[PDB]
Amino acid sequence: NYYATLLTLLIAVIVFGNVLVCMAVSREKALQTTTNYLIVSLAVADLLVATLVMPWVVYLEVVGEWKFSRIHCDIFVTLDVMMCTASALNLCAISIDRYTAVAMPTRYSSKRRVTVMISIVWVLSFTISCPLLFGLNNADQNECIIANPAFVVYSSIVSFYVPFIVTLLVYIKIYIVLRRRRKRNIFEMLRIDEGLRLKIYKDTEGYYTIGIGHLLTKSPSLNAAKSELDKAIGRNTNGVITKDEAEKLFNQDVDAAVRGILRNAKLKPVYDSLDAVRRAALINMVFQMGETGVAGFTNSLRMLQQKRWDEAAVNLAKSRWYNQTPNRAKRVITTFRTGTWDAYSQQKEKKATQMAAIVAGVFIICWLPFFITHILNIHCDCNIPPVLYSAFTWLGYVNSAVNPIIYTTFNIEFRKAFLKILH
Numbered sequence: 024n025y026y027a028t029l030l031t032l033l034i035a036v037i038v039f040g041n042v043l044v045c046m047a048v049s050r051e052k053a054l055q056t057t058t059n060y061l062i063v064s065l066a067v068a069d070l071l072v073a074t075l076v077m078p079w080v081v082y083l084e085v086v087g088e089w090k091f092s093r094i095h096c097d098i099f100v101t102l103d104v105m106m107c108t109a110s111a112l113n114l115c116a117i118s119i120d121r122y123t124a125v126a127m128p129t130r131y132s133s134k135r136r137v138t139v140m141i142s143i144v145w146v147l148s149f150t151i152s153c154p155l156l157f158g159l160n161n162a163d164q165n166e167c168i169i170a171n172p173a174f175v176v177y178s179s180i181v182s183f184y185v186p187f188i189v190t191l192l193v194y195i196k197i198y199i200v201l202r203r204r205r206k207r208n209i210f211e212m213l214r215i216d217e218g219l220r221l222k223i224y225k226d227t228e229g230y231y232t233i234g235i236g237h238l239l240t241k242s243p244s245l246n247a248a249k250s251e252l253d254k255a256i257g258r259n260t261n262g263v264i265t266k267d268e269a270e271k272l273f274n275q276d277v278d279a280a281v282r283g284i285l286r287n288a289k290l291k292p293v294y295d296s297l298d299a300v301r302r303a304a305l306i307n308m309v310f311q312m313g314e315t316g317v318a319g320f321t322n323s324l325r326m327l328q329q330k331r332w333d334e335a336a337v338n339l340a341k342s343r344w345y346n347q348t349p350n351r352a353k354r355v356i357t358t359f360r361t362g363t364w365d366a367y368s369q370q371k372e373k374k375a376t377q378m379a380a381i382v383a384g385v386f387i388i389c390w391l392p393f394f395i396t397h398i399l400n401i402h403c404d405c406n407i408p409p410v411l412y413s414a415f416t417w418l419g420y421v422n423s424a425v426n427p428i429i430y431t432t433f434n435i436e437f438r439k440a441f442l443k444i445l446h
């Protein structure tokens with residue numbers, strides 16, 4: 024047949040791509056991390072799908088019927104559920120290892136942590152699929168387990184929806200931490216450049232300000248400038264505030280600065296194109312020069328928009344801004360060029376955390392239409408086009424071959440590693 028050939032071709036792609044993932048991590052220094060060890064554990068889960076499950080699936084297409092015995096069927100379904108649950112439980116362990124790398128501060132303590140995580144993945148996958156060999160410990164005596172009306176509920180909830188929610192809660196907790204970091208990094212970036220003042224003072228235009236460039240009022244009365252300060256800090260500040268109280272005010276000024284940047288037709292385009300780190304450098308400039316002045320760097324802003332980080336740095340050093348405050352300018356131009364916090368303190372893990380979430384998302388993209396279909400079989404009893412049911416099942420098995428394709432795109436170390444193995 025034609026569809027059986029494609030399935031066998033898929034088996035080759037699954038094996039070819041995932042054998043690469045194993046050898047690459049096994050032989051490349053910069054690829055020998057905790058996450059990458061859980062990645063090869065993920066590659067083994069997919070390697071076993073190609074070898075212990077797909078032969079049953081390609082057989083299932085040539086024959087056109089489930090012409091196994093009842094024990095062969097139970098074995099196949101048990102292995103199919105297990106090797107796919109290991110993929111889900113591996114993506115869960117990957118997120119958790121991604122949480123500890125971001126949220127927590129050893130070459131020996133970490134390796135022991137990976138060994139425990141991997142063992143839990145495969146022992147749990149076994150214990151979850153082991154009931155399927157024995158009638159799901161339910162009432163289905165003389166029939167295969169996939170004929171059990173409770174199999175769909177079991178493998179959906181236990182093997183998929185519960186790993187789905189837990190992993191989703193971890194990544195949400197991960198995003199929240201990274202967003203607190205960006206709000207903290209920008210505060211430090213400007214208390215180094217602009218300066219943190221805890222008592223009321225006058226800016227260069229005569230207005231009473233406090234914190235990091237926060238005009239209390241444009242009124243000349245000092246007593247009135249204190250009224251607006253206490254109405255915003257909540258307490259009788261008496262002129263002095265905490266560095267924490269000033270950090271709350273700074274975040275308000277930053278958010279306000281973004282509402283205007285996006286409402287500025289000359290700054291909104293480049294602002295979208297910018298990485299989050301380079302986006303803080305643009306906020307630094309509007310904090311110093313205002314949105315009016317930054318919009319005058321048209322030749323430079325287009326180069327940031329065109330990813331020309333080299334030239335955008337060379338042009339910005341030819342401005343009257345670089346000549347007026349050169350120390351701060353060189354620090355911000357460095358941030359526009361490198362895209363990190365080297366000038367001020369940059370986490371090198373974010374790139375790996377973004378790839379881990381992309382793999383988890385592609386996973387959900389591939390299997391969710393399959394489990395959405397199950398919900399429809401139960402809801403309306405409408406018999407679904409078997410070509411569609413067969414498609415969403417194959418799409419889920421296809422997921423076993425997409426992960427190595429993602430490592431070549433989003434990871435320079437994985438991409439250059441594979442090309443060295445093929446040469």
Ligand SMILES: Cc1nc2n(c(=O)c1CCN1CCC(c3noc4cc(F)ccc34)CC1)CCCC2
Pocket residue numbers: 080103104105107108110111178179182183390412413416419
């Ligand atoms: C062979 C077959 N053939 C057909 N259909 C089938 O459902 C099947 C079986 C499909 N297996 C897909 C993976 C499932 C699974 N279990 O646990 C998991 C955990 C995960 F994270 C992700 C997936 C799973 C268990 C069922 C439907 C009718 C068309 C022909």
Ligand SMILES: CCCCCCCC/C=C\CCCCCCCC(=O)O
Pocket residue numbers: 123136189
């Ligand atoms: C021993 C070194 C580890 C240091 C970081 C801690 C690692 C994770 C610690 C505890 C994991 C919590 C147990 C997870 C329970 C989830 C069960 C569930 O929600 O269904």
